[PDB]
Design a protein around this ligand. Structure first.
Ligand code: HEM
Length: 153
């Protein structure tokens, strides 16, 4: 999917996320949830939050933030050689959580948003381009598995 120059960009940008996984993961989910509230309904432990302060105030959300971005970071470091770590991911989001691939689109957008926000001016045009394709690759490999399963919705 990507060139090596491009993976290079991806991994350079991921290095900013690794300096504060917890803080980045928090703001990614908050951006996802405040923007697309129907997404909050896919989590029974976040059902209760109703405001963004409460969200910001939840330590559990930070925890969930760290799990999601730790797992993502592990896939990105495989430079597209992720059949092994994505299958399980794809199977559980489809059969167990029942996550439409649109929500995966939404968080992909939420990551890009958050990176600009926390790093205004040092998330260059090339960087945005390498990162965007990486997330698209991710999402595409998941949609193929969703298709197998007929996870129609
Ligand atoms: C960037 C893409 C994402 C990654 C890497 C990711 C990763 C993970 C991981 C590692 C887990 C725990 C292990 C498992 O259940 O497989 C998890 C659970 C879960 N994910 Fe995802 N996830 C992503 C996107 C989403 C999105 C977009 C939603 C819904 C809007 C979502 C909803 C859930 C739910 C409901 C659980 C179970 C939560 C709990 O009770 O702990 N995930 N995810």
């Amino acid at each position: 999917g990507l060139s090596d120059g491009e993976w290079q960009q991806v991994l350079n940008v991921w290095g900013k996320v690794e300096a504060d996984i917890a803080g980045h993961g928090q703001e990614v989910l908050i951006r996802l949830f405040t923007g697309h509230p129907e997404t909050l309904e896919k989590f029974d432990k976040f059902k209760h939050l109703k405001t963004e302060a409460e969200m910001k105030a939840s330590e559990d959300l930070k925890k969930t933030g760290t799990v999601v971005l730790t797992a993502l970071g592990g896939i990105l470091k495989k430079k597209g050689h992720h059949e092994a770590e994505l299958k399980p991911l794809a199977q559980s989001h489809a059969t167990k959580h029942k996550i439409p691939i649109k929500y995966l689109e939404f968080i992909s957008d939420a990551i890009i948003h958050v990176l600009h926000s926390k790093h205004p001016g040092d998330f260059g045009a090339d960087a945005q381009g390498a990162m965007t394709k990486a997330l698209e690759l991710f999402r595409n490999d998941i949609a193929a598995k969703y298709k197998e399963l007929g996870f129609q919705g």
